[PDB]
Amino acid sequence: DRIKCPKKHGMKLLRAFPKLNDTAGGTSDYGWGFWCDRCHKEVPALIKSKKRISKAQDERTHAPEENTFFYHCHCGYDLCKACGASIIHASNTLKENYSTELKNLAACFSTP
Ligand SMILES: [Zn+2]
Ligand SMILES: [Zn+2]
């Protein structure tokens, strides 16, 4: 699922720094990389990792320090991979505690 910026727009996962045309403001130049609007990390270059060990590993969760991509919003709000990783983890945990609580609810209902 697409991560949203605080202004509720759906952000996009990018594998290369965007062009002037991708950000709302005129002057956003991502030539030397950007800063995460949340953990303030200065991510200066996008690197291609050769690990490739993702048969069934969410790419967004594996090797968060591996800045192989980032999330950008047109508004200009950005998230490093690491910050994206923690919201996928947190949201997956909510879905798990939901399906679990739902299976337990069905069981409590259909058990005397
Ligand atoms: Zn961050
Ligand atoms: Zn935005």
Numbering used by the authors: 567 to 678
Give the published text.
Kinetoplastids are evolutionarily divergent eukaryotes that have an unconventional set of kinetochore proteins. In this study, we focused on KKT2 and KKT3, which are homologous to each other and have three domains conserved among kinetoplastids: A protein kinase domain classified as unique among known eukaryotic kinase subfamilies, a central domain of unknown function, and divergent polo boxes. In this report, we have revealed a unique zinc-binding domain in the KKT2 and KKT3 central domain, which is important for their kinetochore localization and function in T. brucei. In this study, we show that KKT2 and KKT3 are important for recruiting multiple kinetochore proteins, including KKT1, KKT4, KKT14, KKT22, and KKT23, while localization of KKT2 and KKT3 is independent from various kinetochore proteins. Together with the fact that KKT2 and KKT3 have DNA-binding motifs, these results support the hypothesis that KKT2 and KKT3 locate at the base of kinetoplastid kinetochores and play crucial roles in recruiting other kinetochore proteins.
